[PDB]
Structure formats: C-alpha cells, structure tokens
Curated annotation (Swiss-Prot), chain A:
The flexible hinge domain, which separates the large intramolecular coiled coil regions, allows the heterotypic interaction with the corresponding domain of SMC5, forming a V-shaped heterodimer. It is found in: Nucleus; Chromosome. Belongs to the SMC family. SMC6 subfamily. It comes from Saccharomyces cerevisiae (strain ATCC 204508 / S288c). The chain holds residues 389 to 436 of 1114 of the full protein. It comes from the Eukaryota. This is Structural maintenance of chromosomes protein 6. Present with 339 molecules/cell in log phase SD medium. Component of the Smc5-Smc6 complex which consists of KRE29, MMS21, NSE1, NSE3, NSE4, NSE5, SMC5 and SMC6. Acts in a DNA repair pathway for removal of UV-induced DNA damage that is distinct from classical nucleotide excision repair and in repair of ionizing radiation damage. Functions in homologous recombination repair of DNA double strand breaks and in recovery of stalled replication forks. Probably plays a role in structure.
Swiss-Prot record, chain C:
The flexible hinge domain, which separates the large intramolecular coiled coil regions, allows the heterotypic interaction with the corresponding domain of smc6, forming a V-shaped heterodimer. This is Structural maintenance of chromosomes protein 5. Sumoylated by MMS21. Acts in a DNA repair pathway for removal of UV-induced DNA damage that is distinct from classical nucleotide excision repair and in repair of ionizing radiation damage. Functions in homologous recombination repair of DNA double strand breaks and in recovery of stalled replication forks.
Curated annotation (Swiss-Prot), chain D:
Present with 2800 molecules/cell in log phase SD medium. It is found in: Nucleus; Cytoplasm. The gene is MMS21. It comes from the Eukaryota. Acts as an E3 ligase mediating SUMO/Smt3 attachment to SMC5 and YKU70. Acts in a DNA repair pathway for removal of UV-induced DNA damage that is distinct from classical nucleotide excision repair and in repair of ionizing radiation damage. Functions in homologous recombination repair of DNA double strand breaks and in recovery of stalled replication forks. Belongs to the NSE2 family. The chain holds residues 215 to 267 of 267 of the full protein. Component of the Smc5-Smc6 complex which consists of KRE29, NSE1, NSE2/MMS21, NSE3, NSE4, NSE5, SMC5 and SMC6. This is E3 SUMO-protein ligase MMS21. Zn(2+) binds at C7, C12.
Length: 48, 49, 50, 53
C-alpha cells in the first residue's frame, strides 16, 4: 500500500512537472508571438 | 491547444490529488494495525521467553 | 531499505516516462516524414510576380 | 500415475518424485538478470536507432 501511495505521489509530481513545463513553454511562446506578430504587419495593416 | 492540454493536465492533477488523499487516508490505518501487531507479537515473544 | 525501494520506484517511473517520451519522439519523426511528404510537391511561386 | 519417472533431461539417469524437488533461487535470479539486461539493451538500441533518424 505504501508502494502504491508513493507511486501515485510520484505520478502527481510528474504531472506537476509537466504542467510547469507546458505553462512556461506556452508563456515564452506567447511572448514570442506577441513580439513577432506586430514586427512588420502593423505598417501594412495601418497603411491599408 | 497547448493551453487546452494544460487545463486538462490541471484537472487530472487535482482529481489524482484527491485520489492520493483518500488512498493515504485509508492506508494510514493499515500502518496502524501493523504497529499494533508488532507490539502484540514482541510482547508475546517476551512473555513466552 | 525503504528509501532504496522508493528510489527503485523512482527509477522505474522514470523508465516509464522514458518510454512515453520515446513514443512522443516516434510521433515527431512520423510528423517529420509527413513534412517531407508535403515538401514533395514544390509550390514554386510564379516566375513573374514582379 | 507413476511413482517415479526418469529425469527428462540428459547427462543423467535417475528417477525422482515430488518431494525431492526444492526451490532454487539461482533460476529466478538468472531469469531476472536476463530480463533486465535484455530490457536495457533493447532500450539502448531503440534509442540509438531513433537518434540516427
């Protein structure tokens, strides 16, 4: 039973690590897309 | 889609945390009777000797 | 001994995560093959845009 | 149906019953080490082959 509990806790820790990796990756990606969306599109769009 | 996956991961994390909580709650008494049997067995062995 | 058993369990769920990441990267290689399949058709821009 | 039967394996000639058999830890020790080594070698070859691609 202790082995099963530590297994479930380890799976929980791995899920938390996956959540942290995904959230930090998506935050960096959102920063990149915010930086690059208006890199050159703003001039053409405002002109149009 | 990454945010959707992260939300699903969070839901799974919370539900599995509830699962581990109930598992610990039911498992601690097992350790309790294990300790009680240990004390009973060692006392019985001492009295026997 | 209990800590060693816990560390064995650590090693083995790390092995499980290794298998999971191997599945992820085989999926990525299939995606790469599909990318080459898309690359097979050229889609060259016309020679007379300008 | 037979009280004593010849040992099926070669390099010997004798008849044994149920009660002569005892557990041999060496056999499952060999089985476990063989399974673990084959698992590690399969993982290594698969990882290297994927690294090739």
């Amino acid at each position: 039973v202790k082995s099963r509990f530590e297994k479930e806790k380890s799976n929980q820790a791995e899920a938390q690590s996956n959540i942290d990796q995904g959230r930090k990756k998506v935050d960096a990606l959102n920063k990149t897309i915010a930086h690059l969306e208006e890199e050159l599109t703003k001039e053409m769009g405002g002109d149009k | 889609n990454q945010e959707q996956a992260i939300a699903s991961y969070e839901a799974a994390k919370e539900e599995l945390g509830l699962k581990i909580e109930q598992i610990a709650q039911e498992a601690q008494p097992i350790k309790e009777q294990y300790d009680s049997t240990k004390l009973a067995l060692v006392e019985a062995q001492d009295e026997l000797q | 001994r209990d800590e060693v058993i816990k560390k064995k369990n650590q090693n083995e769920y790390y092995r499980g995560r290794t298998k999971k990441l191997q599945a992820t990267i085989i999926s990525t290689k299939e995606d790469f093959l599909r990318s080459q399949e898309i690359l097979a058709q050229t889609h060259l821009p016309e020679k007379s845009v300008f | 149906g037979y009280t004593t039967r010849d040992c099926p394996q070669a390099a010997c000639s004798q008849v044994v019953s149920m009660r002569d058999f005892v557990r041999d830890p060496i056999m499952e020790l060999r089985c476990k080490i063989a399974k673990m080594k084959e698992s590690q070698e399969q993982d290594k070859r698969s990882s290297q082959a994927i690294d090739v691609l």
